[PDB]
Structure formats: C-alpha cells, structure tokens
Design a protein around this ligand. Structure first.
Ligand SMILES: *[C@@H]1O[C@H](CO)[C@@H](O[C@@H]2O[C@H](CO)[C@@H](O[C@@H]3O[C@H](CO)[C@@H](O)[C@H](O[C@H]4O[C@H](CO)[C@@H](O)[C@H](O)[C@@H]4O[C@H]4O[C@H](CO)[C@@H](O)[C@H](O)[C@@H]4O[C@H]4O[C@H](CO)[C@@H](O)[C@H](O)[C@@H]4O)[C@@H]3O)[C@H](O)[C@H]2NC(C)=O)[C@H](O)[C@H]1NC(C)=O
Ligand SMILES: *[C@@H]1O[C@H](CO)[C@@H](O[C@@H]2O[C@H](CO)[C@@H](O[C@@H]3O[C@H](CO)[C@@H](O)[C@H](O[C@H]4O[C@H](CO)[C@@H](O)[C@H](O)[C@@H]4O[C@H]4O[C@H](CO)[C@@H](O)[C@H](O)[C@@H]4O[C@H]4O[C@H](CO)[C@@H](O)[C@H](O)[C@@H]4O)[C@@H]3O)[C@H](O)[C@H]2NC(C)=O)[C@H](O)[C@H]1NC(C)=O
Ligand SMILES: *[C@@H]1O[C@H](CO)[C@@H](O[C@@H]2O[C@H](CO)[C@@H](O[C@@H]3O[C@H](CO)[C@@H](O)[C@H](O[C@H]4O[C@H](CO)[C@@H](O)[C@H](O)[C@@H]4O[C@H]4O[C@H](CO)[C@@H](O)[C@H](O)[C@@H]4O[C@H]4O[C@H](CO)[C@@H](O)[C@H](O)[C@@H]4O)[C@@H]3O)[C@H](O)[C@H]2NC(C)=O)[C@H](O)[C@H]1NC(C)=O
Ligand SMILES: *[C@@H]1O[C@H](CO)[C@@H](O[C@@H]2O[C@H](CO)[C@@H](O)[C@H](O)[C@H]2NC(C)=O)[C@H](O)[C@H]1NC(C)=O
Ligand SMILES: *[C@@H]1O[C@H](CO)[C@@H](O[C@@H]2O[C@H](CO)[C@@H](O)[C@H](O)[C@H]2NC(C)=O)[C@H](O)[C@H]1NC(C)=O
Ligand SMILES: *[C@@H]1O[C@H](CO)[C@@H](O[C@@H]2O[C@H](CO)[C@@H](O)[C@H](O)[C@H]2NC(C)=O)[C@H](O)[C@H]1NC(C)=O
Ligand SMILES: *[C@@H]1O[C@H](CO)[C@@H](O)[C@H](O)[C@H]1NC(C)=O
Ligand SMILES: *[C@@H]1O[C@H](CO)[C@@H](O)[C@H](O)[C@H]1NC(C)=O
Ligand SMILES: *[C@@H]1O[C@H](CO)[C@@H](O)[C@H](O)[C@H]1NC(C)=O
Ligand SMILES: [Ca+2]
Ligand SMILES: [Ca+2]
Ligand SMILES: [Ca+2]
Lengths: 107, 389, 389, 389
C-alpha cells in the first residue's frame, strides 16, 4: 500500500504570508499526488491533482510541487479563511492512501 | 495496388461512428497463447487491414509477462495479425525488432520502421518490402522515438515524424521524407509547436495532418501539416478550448492557438483528431486525470476558432472503463467518393492501476465513420482481473 | 526468382551491425507449444527469409524434452518457420528428417540435405524441390556430418562441405558440388587445413568462402575458398592473432597462417567470419573458456596478415550472457549495389551449464551490416531458468 | 498438374530404403493439441505430399480420448496435414466424415471417399474437388469397408476396392472404377483370392497392383492386379513361403499360390508389397504373433515362385518396438526416369497392449526407396507411456 506521510501536523503562518506543507509517499508515485482541503467542519475540496494541476476554480495562490516521494503544497497571501486541515492523497495505484492532514493555524 | 497511392479524396461527412474492429485479446488471452502488447495500431494494405502493436515477448499467462509495464527492452518487437483476431503466438507476423514503430504502405509495398537501442545510443532501421534498407542512428542521444501508429504516403513519399531528446523540455523533432526506404530529405520541426511526441496522422487532398502530443507543457494538442509533394510542413496548436490531451486542466472558455495551454506539465497520452472545417471531430478520454473513458466530439473548426465548443458527441468507452492511446487510420484503397475516417483506442489493462496482476497488456477497439446517425454503444475491454489470480 | 542466382556483387562496407531478427523462443516457450531445437540457422528464398533449426521432437515444456542435450537421435528433424516467430508446433515446416543439415536456394528452388543414421552407418539424402533426389551413404563410418547453416549456390551449383570421421584427429572431409539435387562432382579436402567441421559460408564475386571449425588442434579457424564455376577449392587458416574459436588459448602477438594454432585440442564451436581485405570482421565468444558473450571485431586483413589486431568492435551478447553457435547468411535477392552481410548467434539455454532443468533448447539472434555507425546493444536470450521449476 | 496422370513409368531399382517422413505425433502430443488418429496413410498431390489418417475427434490429452480403441463412431473423420508435422487441431484439414477412407489425386484434383454408418446400414460418399458427388449405400449390410491408404488413378479412372460382409468368412468385395467422382462401372471380385480387406495399391506401366488382407484364412497375402484402361482385374496369392500377414504361422519351405496358406484364421493387419520380378520387396512385422517390429525383405519373384526365400533385407522398426498397419504410396509427379517406391508404417501406441493409458493413437514412419545401398536405422514412435500418468 503506498504510505503517504505528512510532518509536521500543525503549522502557523501569518496573514498575507506563505506556508509550505510537505507530504511524502513511500515510493515513486510519479507526481500522482492529490491535495484536498477540509475547511473546519466541512467536506474535503479537491484543490490540486497530479501535484500541480489546480481543480476547477481554486485560486492560483495554491501551488503544489514535487517529484519522486517528495511533494509540497504552498499557499501564498494567506487569507484568515485558509485555516483548515490539508491532506495529501496518492493517486497512482490502489488503494488510494492519504496523509495525516496538517492543520494550518493563522498567526 | 501495383502503383503508388495519391491521396486524391477528401474525408467523408463524419456524422456518427460504426464499430469496425474488436480484438477481445485480454479476455481470450486468459486461456489462449496470446501476446502481451501495448502501443497498438491499425494500417491497411491495398489488400487487407491488420492490427499492429509492439509485442513484449511473452504470453499474458506466461511467467515472463511480469514487469511488462516497462516500455522498452530487447524483447519488444513490432508484430501484426488479422483484423479483430487476438495477437496470438501462432498468427503474429514479426515486422521488425524494436520498441518504437510506425508502419505504412505506399500503394506498392510497405515501410516499417522499428527503433531499438539503449536510451543513449539508439538506432532506427527502415524496412521496405520486408528487408532492411536504411537505418538512422541517434542524434540527441536520449531516447529516439516515433509515431506509434501508421504513417501516410503520397506518390512514394512518406513523411515520418521522429523526436529525439527529452520529454521534459525542448527535444530534437525532425520530419523525414522517405521514398521506398531511402531518405529523400528531412527537415527540423518548424512552427509554433513546443514539443512533439507520437503523432497520429491521416491524409487527404494531397496533404498530411498529424495531431501529436505535447509532453512538456501541452494540454491542447499540437498539429503538424506536411505537404508531401513539396516536402515542407508547419505546426500550430488546436485552438479549441475543448482540451483533448490527458491529464488536462479543465477546459476554458477561450483557448490558445499558437502556444501550449497551461496546467499539466510533463505528461500526455498519444491522441488523434479529424480536422476538416465544420466536419472536425476530436477525441479525448472522459476523465481529466486518468485514462478512463474515451469519447468523440464534433467541434466545428476546432483547429482555427478559439472558442469552439462541441456540437455533437459520441461515447465510445465508458468513464467507468479503461482506455489508453488513440491514433487515426483510414483504408485508403476502399471503394468510393471519399475517405472513411477511422481511429482506434488502446485499452490498457494491468499495471499500474490494476496492480493485482503484474503484467500490462491491452486490448484494441476500432471504429470508422458513418454519414448516418447510428446510435451509440460503449465497448469495454471486458476481462475480470480476478480470474487471473 | 525463376532463374538461377549468380553471385554478381561484392559485400557492402561493414561499418557496424543492425538487428535483423529476434526469436525470443525460450521466453515464449515457457507458455506456448514451442519446439526444442538447437543448431539453428537462417536462409533466404527469393521470396522470404526464415529461421531453420534442428527440432528435437518435443516442446520445451513437454516431459520428452528431458535429455535433449544429446545431439543426434531419430526424433531430430530439420524444421523451418517465419523470421523472428518462435519455432512453434503449429507453424513449423519439416524440411527433412536427420541430425545434420544444410539448406540453400539456388534461385529456382531449394536444396535441403538432412543426414541420419547410427554413427557407424549413416546416410545423407538430398532433397530438391521438396522431394528426395540423391542420397550418399557413409564413407568413413563414424558420424557423417555437414554445414549446420545455409549453403551457397552459383548458377545451379552449390558446394556443400561434409566431414566423415573422427573429431579427434584426421577425418575424411570432401567438398561436393551438386546442381539441382544430382552430384556434379566431389573432391577431397585439399590445402593446409587440418580438420574440418561446420563450415559457415557466404558468397561474393563468383567465389565461396567458408570459415569452419578445427576440432582436432585449432583455435584459429580454417578457411575453404571454393570456385563454384571451376569446381575447385583450397584451404588455409586465418592468419590473425585474434583467435576466434572457443575454448581458446589467449591471443598471441603474431599467429599462424598455414597451420593450426596450438593450445586447445579436441574442441571448438561453429563460427563465422567476413573476409574482405580492410573490410574483414571476425566474431568470437567473449569468454575464452566458455560460450558466453559474442562479439564482432573489425580486424583489417585477418585472413592474410599475421599480426592483425582489431581496429573497431561491437558487442553483441554480453559476457554475463550465454551464446553458442554462429554462422553467416545473406539475402542474396535483396535490392542494391551489394551484399548486406549478416550472421546469427545460437543462444543455448539448458544443460549442461544450467542443469537445474533437463532440456537444452536455444534461442536465435540475427544481425545484418550497416554502412552507418549505429550504436550498440546487447541481446540476451532472456528467460529465467527459475520459472520452469 | 492440369491434366490427368498416366502411369507411364516402372518402379526404380529398390536397393535399400531412405527415411522420407517422420511424425513424432505421440511424443509431441503429450504437450500439444494433437489429434488421436489411427489408420494413417500418405498421398501426394502434384503439388505436395501429406499425411492422411482417420481422426477420433479428441486430443491425446483431452478426457474424450478415452476409448479410442473402438474403430468406428460418429466422431471419426478423414483428416490431412503437412508432411511430417503432427496432426494438430490447428493444422488438420477435414477431408470428409467417416470411419473408412481412401483418397487419391487424378492429376487434375482429388477424390476422397469416407464410409459412415451403423454396421448394418452404412453409406460411402465420394467427394471430388472437395464436394460430394456420388454416394453408394451398403450392399451386404454388415460393415462396408475400403482401402485405408491412397488409391491409384490412370487417365481419370481410379479403381477402389470395397468389401462389404463378414470378416469371418465369404464377404462381397467389388472393384469400383470411378472417373471424376461418377461411377464408370464396377465388377465383383474375381480370381483365386478368398477374402479381401484393406488393399495397399501402387501403379506402374499402366497397371494397378493391390496387396490386400485375408482375414478369413490367410497368412499369405492376396493380390489384385487391375487393368485401369480395360477395367478388369484378377486376384491370386503371393506364392512365396515368406509369409507376410500377422499373426502368422511360421514360414514354410514351399508355399501356396492359388489358395490361402493355413494356420491363422480370423485375423490380419493391413500390409503392402512391391512386386516387380527380381526387384520384389515384401514387408511383414518381425513378430509372428504381434504387431511389433516391421522389416523389409527382398524376395526376388515372390508373387510367382513358390519357394522364394529372401536375399536382402532391412530393419525398419525394431522387434522391441511397436508397429501396426502398413501401406504403399509413390509421388507420381516427382521428376525422373521412374517411380520411387515408398511405404508407411503406422505405429500404434495405447490400448490394448499398453493399457496403462485408455487411448489408442499412433505415430507414422515413411520411407522411400534408394538405388544406393544406404545403411539402416530403426525408427521408434518414441513416447514413454509413463509420462501420461
Ligand atoms: C442513441 O445514440 C445516439 C447517438 O450517439 C444518442 O445521441 C447522441 O447522444 C450524445 C449524448 O446525449 C450526444 O452527445 C452530447 O452532445 C452535446 C452537444 O449537444 C455535447 O456537448 C456533449 O458533450 C459534453 O458532455 C459530455 C457528457 O454528456 C462530456 O463527456 C463532454 O466532454 C462534453 O462536456 C464537457 O466538455 C464540454 C466542452 O468543453 C464542456 O462544455 C462541459 O462543461 C464538459 O466539461 C467538463 O468535463 C470535461 C471531461 O468530461 C472536462 O475536461 C472539462 O474540464 C469539464 O470539467 C455530448 O457529447 C450526441 O450529440 C447525440 N447525437 C445525436 C445524433 O443525437 C442517443 O441519445 C441514443 N439514444 C438512446 C435512446 O439512448
Ligand atoms: C554507442 O555504440 C558505439 C558502437 O558500438 C560504441 O562505440 C564502439 O564501442 C566499442 C567499445 O568501446 C568499440 O570496440 C572496441 O574497439 C577496440 C578498438 O579501438 C577493440 O580493440 C576492442 O576489442 C578488444 O576489447 C574488447 C573489450 O572492450 C574485447 O572483448 C575484445 O576481445 C578485444 O580485446 C581482446 O582481444 C584483443 C585482440 O587480440 C587484445 O588486444 C586484448 O588484449 C583482448 O584480449 C584478451 O581477451 C580476449 C577475449 O575477451 C582473450 O581471448 C585474449 O586472449 C585476451 O586475454 C573493442 O571491440 C568500437 O570500436 C566502438 N565503435 C565506434 C564506431 O565508436 C559507443 O561507445 C556507444 N556509445 C555509448 C555512449 O555507449
Ligand atoms: C549397415 O546397414 C546395412 C543395410 O541395412 C546392413 O546390411 C544389411 O543388414 C541386414 C542384416 O544383416 C541384411 O538382412 C538380412 O538379409 C538376409 C539375407 O542375406 C535375410 O535372410 C535376413 O532376413 C531373415 O533374418 C531376419 C533377422 O536377421 C528376420 O527378421 C527375417 O524375417 C528373415 O528370417 C526369417 O525369415 C526367413 C524367410 O522365411 C527364414 O529363412 C528365417 O528362418 C526367419 O524365419 C523365422 O522368423 C520369422 C519372423 O522373424 C518367422 O515368421 C518365421 O516363421 C521363422 O520362425 C535379413 O533381412 C541385409 O541384407 C544387409 N544389406 C546389405 C546391403 O548389406 C549392414 O549390416 C549395416 N552395417 C553395420 C556396421 O551395422
Ligand atoms: C515477478 O513477479 C513476482 C510475483 O509474481 C514479484 O515478486 C516480488 O519480488 C520482490 C523482490 O523484487 C519481493 O520483495 C516481493 O515480496 C515479491 N512478491 C512475491 C509474491 O513473491 C517479482 O518482483 C516480479 N519480478 C521479478 C523480476 O521477478
Ligand atoms: C528425465 O528427467 C528425470 C527428472 O525429471 C530424471 O530423473 C533421474 O533419473 C535417474 C535415473 O536415470 C535417477 O537416479 C535420479 O534420481 C532421477 N531424479 C529424479 C528427480 O527423479 C531422468 O533421469 C530423466 N531421464 C529419463 C530417461 O527418464
Ligand atoms: C474412461 O476412463 C475411465 C478412467 O479414466 C474409466 O474408468 C472405469 O470405469 C468403469 C465403469 O465403466 C469402472 O468399473 C472402473 O473402476 C473405472 N476406473 C476408474 C479409474 O475410474 C472409464 O470406464 C472410461 N470410459 C468411460 C465411458 O467413462
Ligand atoms: C500521383 O500523383 C502525382 C502528383 O499528383 C501524379 O503526377 C501521378 O501520376 C499520380 N499517380 C497515381 C498512380 O495516381
Ligand atoms: C549466371 O552466370 C553464368 C556464368 O557467370 C552466366 O553465363 C549466366 O548467363 C548467368 N545467368 C544468370 C541468371 O545470371
Ligand atoms: C494418358 O493415357 C491415355 C491412354 O494411355 C492417352 O491416350 C492420353 O493421351 C494420355 N494423356 C496424358 C496426359 O498422358
Ligand atoms: Ca501534456
Ligand atoms: Ca579447436
Ligand atoms: Ca489372416
């Protein structure tokens, strides 16, 4: 099963600033990494897939990157409302495994 | 025929699609001596049409099918067999040895080119009338590649597009003009395209159209139009917002004619199109992220108008079913007023998505074009990955 | 053609080698009804080229493949099948029954000779246009043997070299000249050679060259050049220090033209060479002790100059991979200025070295010559002796 | 040819025998989709020679091979396939449906007759150019039977010998003369013979010779000589003391020309002979009680002189090996001064003698005649009844 690992699990950035959330698969997963966002007490929203393709209508301030086993989501100009849990998923071969979710505190 | 072929006709009115060929190769290969293939295609002789495809040198069931997800090796070989029969050990003809091919027939006999080699020191050998005539050693030294479907010839001359270089960035793509196996000339890729892979080509009214693959930045497909007579070409993109490569960004309102459309870098899937003014039809997978489903869309003027959204469509493979590579072909010797347009859809079964098994084979589906409006059906590969366990 | 063939051309400039044919027979035979063969070769008709080889009368997988290390029996038979397809039960044509063969086509139709018998009372029968015409009973009564690869014909006349006698010492080698199945004459081996086995032969400019095997004392190979027109021949050795037989003593600084080069008595392996002045290329296994690896070396003037060391080379089978028998062949009917030189390399898998299994089959690799400098790749049989357990 | 055949030659000097064809069918059928057959034979077209044999409708290995010792059923069918390839599911041509056959080619195309039916109500249908032309319903109502090997045609006319009646006593044997499928006439058996089964026939110098089987009382074989031109025949026995049927009484000093030779009633085995004056050769199993071994004997004038003992011989199948049915055939279209005489030997493996298995198949061995004295070898079917367990 490919294990996706996220560390740390809590992150704090200021408003208007930037955060980078690292995710890490345990084998080369060929950029087949999806990032979901789960706004406090709501569903996940698919933010990006294939490491950097933004889904329909997430604002270009959410940028992802990666190769191999190391991927990262960057948020720039952090809105007070980006406070949520961010989750990486793997989308290469079954089963679709997730990462622990990183909580983003606003400072 | 006993005479070169000239593309004297134009395409017929494409109003719907009728199934032309079905393989069922993986379903029958669970209990028959079937070959593991991929990169399939279809080409016609004056005489007959056949399924072509790159063998992996093993049967689905044999223990050496394990690890056939790897694209190139010395066990691969361009093979060929009857329309709609599976690619069986006992009925496949080996056309040449290599891991990239293209094959076409010029009216008199056929040209097959198989590329082989280590990635840094590969060579192309051009077979003509089943004997090696010309060979072309690498030029940029990192994986020399070519068409993956039939080429098109006008009066002896067959343009074949080759890329050598990186699939992540600028690569050396050259258009070669052969006639009867010998190289008549070659020029380098010219035009607004930014990267070229696996060009699907068809030919009408003395001109050759190739929808290729932009692997570096493209999600819209780049198009090469080659004058076979004057031995020149140009390259632009498909303007239409109806993006057809895969994976892709979601389709926009307005698109990009002279540049790659942004969103999914370092990826694609070989694909095709029929560009004929109002009678333009495009095909993409149904999924934006994966090779599942395959559908055809009539998008009048998609080459040139950059807000062309589809007016008629047709579901070929269901989105809950797998697809893969597609490419154009026509039976240039069939009787009539015009060219019946046709294509094929590789159906990839196996690793990586269905990794319960260790092989990757594929099945093939073919359809040609009807002037009628025939009703539609979906066409699944059909095997159950659970009976191979 | 519908006319005898005359070797009117000379060899083309041999600058590198391009793969012509690949079998993958053992890999596919782990799950297909494939025949156990050995002593393979390739011959061309006007029409097509085919893989020929001595069947053992069983499939790799069938329980009667056990003990196919034995060379001769009444279950062996010269069989033939499509270029690069495996030698399948359902696509092999039996050419004749025996345990030593040679086969060639004279422009009009083909000659196949299969030798059969107990070692002390064997007979050759010469098939012409698929019917037995002539037969030749033994002359020295201890294993009558012949070529093991295609013969060459000029204007109806085909010299075929036969040895009858001991492989450990003086044996009765005679050159027979057939025309259309009937014996036109035969002479005994004349020249400085000391023992003759398994001559690989090719033909250019009305003359026939045969690199054979010295089983008694030779580690350098003996060469017979036959005038097909005058029906005479001569035999000398390959002067070059680049020893090509196997097992061999390590190569010297200066070698021996008119005598066997000392060091490994009562052994060899069938082998070939292209002797053309500067354009001479030789091939030997890479290992001096065993049949592992196979490589090609350009050694200008190796026939005549006795200090010729190689100037260019090409690795064909890797030294960590098995090889076996090699032999020359050309497509004499292919179009052009000259003869494209080609050869084959038997790939012996099985007993005795890989005795975890009880069969001995082999695979085949073929390459022809390019004027280009194409880059190189190694070409492994490819099967894992562990999936047959 | 595109013209009827006339037997214009005489037999060639028969001095020894050279192997012409080997099947290895049972050995390969232990791991290939091979058919269970029996009653094999060989016939030649102008074009090619082929192995013919009565299929049982199953593969050796398939579970429906069980109980194929029974001779007749509705699953039997005359099938045909390439010289020396096994009778594979994928390469057999069904010639017609039945449990007794005969097949010959008249120069223009071929006649095949398959007999079918329950024993008391059977019918013959005569196929010509692969379409049923004539049919002949039974006449004595207890198992209508025929040749079991190729027939011989002169100028369109092919005599075919049929027996209908009891194999234990007087039966209605009639000689039918067909031309192109239609019956030209038929007469009843006339002469000193006492019972006729399974006539092996060959043809020379405008006359047809048939060595048959006396099932009622004969241990010497009865001979029918048919004038194809005048449409008459006669029947006598082989005078020679060298008894050739099987089982047989031990051979006497003096024999019986115009009567059956006493000793083994209600039995035989189909068999053949080449009757040509000094150049007469006969063949019998080596065992007097069983179908083991098969040998050829030159017995000058064996037809006519009743003390002819053999002067030269040749061991074909070893007495520690199984044999079965034999029959004559020649390639009437082969080039030359004369007819190369040939025969075949069915090799019955299975039940009843080797009842560890429940099938009965057989293998085939063929030999033709050499003017030379070629040395001899024995030719075993070759399979081990123990690998099928
Ligand atoms: C008997 O058979 C006949 C003949 O087949 C049947 O009639 C045919 O039936 C078809 C289905 O009804 C019909 O096709 C449709 O035609 C319309 C035009 O009128 C066309 O727009 C449709 O295509 C869109 O919708 C399909 C799904 O239905 C999508 O898969 C397709 O991609 C098109 O939508 C996507 O792309 C468009 C262009 O950019 C966007 O506008 C749209 O937003 C959408 O985009 C999203 O998804 C994309 C990928 O899925 C993604 O990339 C993108 O980013 C967005 O997120 C469809 O083709 C035929 O025209 C019709 N033909 C005839 C002659 O009638 C008949 O029903 C059958 N009868 C019975 C009884 O069953
Ligand atoms: C892309 O492909 C091209 C084309 O293939 C590549 O270039 C080619 O690459 C080849 C390897 O670099 C090169 O071949 C070599 O050519 C030299 C001449 O310059 C030749 O001497 C070499 O052959 C000797 O060495 C090889 C191993 O490298 C041995 O296997 C061979 O037997 C030769 O050595 C043995 O025999 C010699 C003659 O007697 C002795 O002098 C020597 O001592 C040695 O003998 C010992 O070993 C013997 C058995 O192994 C034993 O019997 C004996 O007793 C001794 O103990 C070699 O062939 C091509 O010329 C070159 N061609 C071109 C056009 O460039 C290119 O690199 C590729 N590019 C990339 C990026 O990979
Ligand atoms: C290389 O190959 C050549 C060519 O093949 C070899 O030479 C050939 O070798 C043969 C064996 O030496 C030889 O055949 C023999 O020829 C004699 C005539 O000279 C012939 O009589 C022999 O046949 C009898 O003996 C064999 C066994 O050897 C029996 O199987 C056969 O049936 C014959 O005997 C039986 O029938 C006879 C006729 O009625 C009776 O006289 C005799 O009593 C016996 O009858 C009993 O057994 C019968 C059944 O087995 C039974 O029914 C009966 O009731 C009795 O009980 C034999 O064919 C070739 O002539 C010879 N050819 C040439 C050109 O040389 C050469 O040796 C090989 N070289 C090497 C180095 O191996
Ligand atoms: C061939 O397939 C087998 C299973 O069919 C593969 O098995 C795995 O091999 C790796 C080592 O490379 C082990 O870590 C796994 O635990 C193996 N699993 C099993 C079920 O044995 C094998 O990798 C494949 N490839 C080769 C080259 O043998
Ligand atoms: C056929 O193969 C088997 C195994 O597949 C061989 O088996 C050996 O036979 C010898 C006797 O000849 C015994 O001493 C060994 O112990 C056997 N080993 C096994 C695993 O059974 C056999 O020799 C081969 N040949 C024949 C002719 O059967
Ligand atoms: C088919 O073969 C089987 C075994 O392969 C035969 O089995 C015997 O059948 C008889 C009844 O007809 C029993 O008395 C025996 O004890 C059976 N033996 C076994 C091992 O089962 C069977 O007769 C054959 N024929 C048919 C028609 O099934
Ligand atoms: C093919 O086309 C060329 C140029 O259009 C023409 O001159 C030639 O005669 C044509 N030949 C055939 C067979 O159509
Ligand atoms: C073949 O060669 C002979 C002698 O060189 C010559 O006389 C003959 O006419 C030639 N025939 C052909 C078909 O080349
Ligand atoms: C065949 O034989 C008949 C009678 O002997 C003869 O009249 C006829 O012309 C011959 N035909 C052929 C093709 O030999
Ligand atoms: Ca792309
Ligand atoms: Ca030696
Ligand atoms: Ca009897």
């Amino acid at each position: 099963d490919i294990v996706m690992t996220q560390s740390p699990k809590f992150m704090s950035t200021s408003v208007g600033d930037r955060v980078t959330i690292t995710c890490k698969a345990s084998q080369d997963v060929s950029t087949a990494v999806v990032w979901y966002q789960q706004k406090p007490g709501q569903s996940p929203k698919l933010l990006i897939y294939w490491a950097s393709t933004r889904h329909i209508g997430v604002p270009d301030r959410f940028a992802g990157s990666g190769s191999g086993t190391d991927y990262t989501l960057t948020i720039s100009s952090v809105q007070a409302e980006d406070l949520a849990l961010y989750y990486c998923q793997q989308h290469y071969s079954p089963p679709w495994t997730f990462g622990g979710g990183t909580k983003l505190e606003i400072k | 025929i006993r005479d070169f072929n000239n593309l004297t006709k134009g395409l017929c009115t494409i109003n719907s699609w009728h199934i032309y060929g079905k393989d069922n190769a993986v379903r029958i290969g669970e209990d028959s001596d079937v070959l593991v293939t991929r990169e399939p295609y279809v080409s016609c002789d004056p005489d007959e049409c056949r399924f072509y495809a790159l063998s992996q040198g093993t049967t689905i069931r044999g223990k050496h099918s394990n690890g056939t997800i790897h694209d190139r090796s010395q066990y691969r070989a361009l093979i060929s067999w009857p329309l709609s029969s599976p690619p069986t050990v006992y009925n496949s003809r080996v056309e040449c040895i290599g891991w990239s091919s293209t094959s076409c027939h010029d009216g008199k006999t056929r040209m097959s080119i198989c590329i082989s080699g280590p990635n840094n020191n590969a060579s192309a050998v051009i077979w003509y009338n089943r004997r090696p005539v010309t060979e072309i050693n690498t030029w940029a030294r990192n994986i020399l590649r070519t068409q993956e479907s039939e080429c098109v010839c006008h009066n002896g001359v067959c343009p074949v597009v080759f890329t050598d270089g990186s699939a992540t960035g600028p690569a050396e793509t050259r258009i070669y003009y052969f006639k009867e196996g010998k190289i008549l000339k070659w020029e380098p890729l010219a035009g607004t395209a930014k990267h070229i892979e696996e060009c699907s080509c068809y030919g009408e009214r003395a001109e050759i159209t190739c929808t290729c693959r932009d692997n570096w930045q493209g999600s819209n497909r780049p198009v090469i139009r080659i004058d076979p007579v004057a031995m020149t070409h140009t390259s632009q993109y498909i303007c239409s917002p109806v993006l057809t490569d895969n994976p892709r960004p979601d389709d926009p309102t307005v698109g990009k004619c002279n540049d790659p459309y942004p969103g999914n870098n370092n990826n694609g899937v070989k694909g095709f199109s029929y560009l004929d003014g109002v009678n333009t039809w495009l095909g993409r997978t149904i999924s934006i992220a994966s090779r599942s489903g395959y559908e055809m869309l009539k998008v009048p003027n998609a080459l040139t108008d950059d807000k062309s959204k589809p007016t008629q469509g047709q579901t070929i493979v269901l989105n809950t079913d797998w697809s893969g590579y597609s490419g154009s072909f026509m039976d240039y010797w069939a009787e009539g007023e015009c060219y019946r347009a046709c294509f094929y859809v590789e159906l990839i079964r196996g690793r990586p998505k269905e990794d319960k098994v260790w092989w990757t084979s594929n099945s093939i589906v073919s359809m040609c074009s009807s002037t009628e409006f025939l009703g539609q059906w979906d066409w699944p590969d059909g095997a159950k990955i659970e009976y191979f366990l």
